[PDB]
Amino acid sequence: VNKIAQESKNIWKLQRAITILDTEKSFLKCMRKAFRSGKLLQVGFTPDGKDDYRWCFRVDEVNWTTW
Amino acid sequence: GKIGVLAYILQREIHEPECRHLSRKFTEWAYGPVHSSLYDLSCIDTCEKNSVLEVIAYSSSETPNRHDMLLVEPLNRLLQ
Amino acid sequence: KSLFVDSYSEILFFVQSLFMLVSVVLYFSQRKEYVASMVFSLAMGWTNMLYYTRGFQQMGIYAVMIEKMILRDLCRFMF
Amino acid sequence: SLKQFVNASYTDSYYKGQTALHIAIERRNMTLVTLLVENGADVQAAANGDFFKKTKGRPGFYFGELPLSLAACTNQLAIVKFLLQNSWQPADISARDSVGNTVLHALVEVADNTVDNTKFVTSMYNEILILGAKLHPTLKLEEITNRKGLTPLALAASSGKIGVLAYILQREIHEPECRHLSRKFTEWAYGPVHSSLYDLSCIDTCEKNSVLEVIAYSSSETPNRHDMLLVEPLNRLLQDKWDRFVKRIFYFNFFVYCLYMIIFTAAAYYRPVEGLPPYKLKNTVGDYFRVTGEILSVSGGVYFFFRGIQYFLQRRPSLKSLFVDSYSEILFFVQSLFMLVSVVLYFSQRKEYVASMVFSLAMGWTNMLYYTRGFQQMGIYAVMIEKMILRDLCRFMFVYLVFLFGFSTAVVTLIEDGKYNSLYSTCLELFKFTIGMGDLEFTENYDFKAVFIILLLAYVILTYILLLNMLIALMGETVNKIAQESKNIWKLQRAITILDTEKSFLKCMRKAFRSGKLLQVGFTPDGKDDYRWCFRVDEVNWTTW
Amino acid sequence: VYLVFLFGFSTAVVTLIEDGKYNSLYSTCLELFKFTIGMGDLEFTENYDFKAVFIILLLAYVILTYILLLNMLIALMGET
Ligand SMILES: CCCCCCCCCCCCC(=O)O[C@@H](COC(=O)CCC)COP(=O)(O)O[C@H]1[C@H](O)[C@@H](O)[C@@H](O)[C@@H](O)[C@@H]1O
Ligand SMILES: CCCCCCCCCCCCC(=O)O[C@@H](COC(=O)CCC)COP(=O)(O)O[C@H]1[C@H](O)[C@@H](O)[C@@H](O)[C@@H](O)[C@@H]1O
Ligand SMILES: CCCCCCCCCCCCCCCC(=O)O[C@H](COC(=O)CCCCCC)COP(=O)(O)OCCN
Ligand SMILES: CCCCCCCCCCCCCCCC(=O)O[C@H](COC(=O)CCCCCC)COP(=O)(O)OCCN
Structure with a gap:
């Protein structure tokens, strides 16, 4: 028990991930709302003149260095 | 199970003209200490065949770092 | 090989169902031995409740620790 | 424009x-x-x-x-x-x-x-x-x-911003026209010895938000509520308050509760066994003592009942903090509730009052552990008992009770037309394995003996051999990780007792205000002189001569 | 701590018991002590009413001393 703390947490998170994937793969209702994170414009300038929307996921961060 | 390369790719940010589009992590806004990042999520959440989440989760148990790979930032936050 | 060293929960739920179906077959075969099958399913049915300790972090990690104790320490001890 | x-x-x-x-x-x-x-x-x-x-x-x-x-x-x-x-x-x-x-x-x-x-x-x-x-x-x-x-300062204390609080409380500004902004002063320094003075304005007492009251009565969501009392002046100040004022009162309270529990135990031990309460008072010495004890026991029950209500109304916990914190208030209150329900059943001409009374009696004795605060080692021990109950016993009991019920249902299903043949009897009989009293052949009223023994061996291996030894291992892991957390929690408990005794105080005494009123700088921004109720702490340093 | 718990539950049990063989602090204290050494009877008497109350008390004692306190003692010795 002293040596499997982090290993146990990681295995639990993998078990929960498997549960999440199985739930979304079953879904029993043809629901599209399972597709999360929203479709945002990243650069708007690909190599050509087109704009790129890429379904990004937002993560807010705080840092008190590198102003 | 190449966790180093996976960690590199998923949060790749390329700061130069005509190579920004190769990034997978972007900064949308930053006010003061606060700043909001955007992770690409193409071929992570869903794709044709080999989603990163499906490939990790359904790995064959001989993969070296299969338990550790979900700690790579966007994947853990996305699963939560 | 991944069928046994991995996915214990799938095996356990499947084996519970196998005990149930063998119980049904014995029941309509006019054998009292269906009871022997049924109770095994019943016992397994309750221990499989631990599958749902995932979804709660503390109990989930606790259940993983139980699994690892079984597979390592209890096995060596029992030999 | x-x-x-x-x-x-x-x-x-x-x-x-x-x-x-x-x-x-x-x-x-x-x-x-x-x-x-x-x-x-x-x-x-x-x-x-x-x-x-x-x-x-x-x-x-x-x-x-x-x-x-x-x-x-x-x-x-x-x-x-x-x-x-x-x-x-x-x-x-x-x-x-x-x-x-x-x-x-x-x-x-x-x-x-x-x-x-x-x-x-x-x-x-x-x-x-x-x-x-x-x-x-x-x-x-x-x-x-x-x-x-x-x-x-009160915002820092209530918000758990331990860094800012630690800065403020021992702030020392060495320049002209900003000395009065200090809260830590160096009064005299002879050799390596020097005697510093901490401000104690708005710490020991003030109008509303004293730092000690803010930290002690924090709402249990504060990040660092256990840690903030380790900030230097606060820990020394609480030790000073304890030693000077509160130790004796707390010992007195412990003694009084001990007398109450002895009297309650004696009264309940000699209850009359005739049917149909209430019982006529016999004209003999023993029964006069008995009824006096009953009155005293009920008086204490009412006492703790109303003190529990006063706690609830004064603090107003928000119905989740009501349960995850202040276990001692809940326990003493529940003891009093059992006492009062026992009174009602006693005068309702029901024998069930005995069932109520003993429960209160049992709780009363376990509540003696509340007073293990105020003694260092027993206080830490009681805190560790609390945390073991809340973490490891609870998780174990969930898993164990699932296994117990599952195998009990399997075994009682296998049994047919026997003495046991009931969920209660088989549950108890499998529970006996946990206390090292398991029969393993307690019945034969079945068919398929091999199934019965396979079930029992599986139950024993899963609960007795795996789960209990695993519980010992997990408690061993926990006790290694809650040493310092236990010290800080005990210090917070004693701080709570200190503040409660000082707020009760029973005699209109002003000596609770410690540290003495010293002229600190004597030069405010104006010509006035500043007296600040400072707290003296001597220190010795063999560097920076 | 153990002796506080032992005496408290002993007094509760002997109060609940009425006109029996045990019906005394000494006998009931010893009979609850037998739980500590793995010999607790757990139905050692019936000379009461409210068997639910009696068994609730004994299970509370068993949980608090045998399952909590002794195992906690082993953990503490390991720490020491
Ligand atoms: C008659 C009565 C018989 C009952 C006997 C059994 C009692 C316990 C029953 C508890 C039920 C819990 C459960 O359902 O199984 C537990 C483990 O149970 C055992 O250890 C049985 C040993 C034998 C976890 O199962 P899981 O599939 O999630 O395993 C993880 C994978 O997910 C992941 O991908 C990784 O590969 C990871 O390495 C895997 O571990
Ligand atoms: C039939 C028989 C039933 C008896 C059941 C009960 C047995 C225990 C008997 C032991 C008596 C000890 C006691 O009287 O209570 C103990 C807690 O006992 C339990 O945990 C029982 C769990 C359920 C201390 O309670 P305390 O008020 O100090 O709580 C702390 C706060 O004060 C502090 O501010 C902090 O916020 C901290 O997070 C809090 O913890
Ligand atoms: C870790 C602690 C474990 C506690 C184990 C139980 C012992 C604690 C009992 C203390 C409670 C009060 C004891 C009162 C003594 C008493 O008055 O009981 C006497 C017996 O005297 C003695 O054996 C002295 C016992 C010596 C005490 C050694 C610590 C006679 O009552 P009997 O029912 O036995 O006789 C009835 C015959 N018809
Ligand atoms: C740590 C877990 C250990 C488990 C210990 C065993 C208790 C678990 C019982 C749960 C199963 C459900 C019991 C159903 C109650 C019931 O209906 O049975 C009642 C008895 O009720 C009770 O004593 C309540 C017990 C108090 C509940 C304390 C948790 C009377 O049936 P008898 O066989 O005794 O009498 C028949 C004589 N002709």
């Missing part, structure tokens, strides 16, 4: 009030700030849109809504100085935002107890205090309260 142009600001409800000065400061552009101030920018424009509020469920950044507070909270000292002491439009250092937070309240709010953040927040706090002294010597910034009535 230019004043309307330069002071143009957003009107939408999200970025409301933001103007070019806010953007100039946010961008760390000194030139733009200077230019905007030159042209009549309003240095008091309040940015009060939803983006500039706490708003835990949305992104944002609270900084106190003012340009001075923005400059301070972004670690830009030069802009802070410029805004405070420019020629065209100096900023109002005492200004308050819509919440009532001044610049110092804002600096406390942006604290988050990381090392770099704590460093810059305390540095900016000190610089702002120095500047306020130089610009407004008669102004006492730290006494300004926000709309909740909290000063920056």
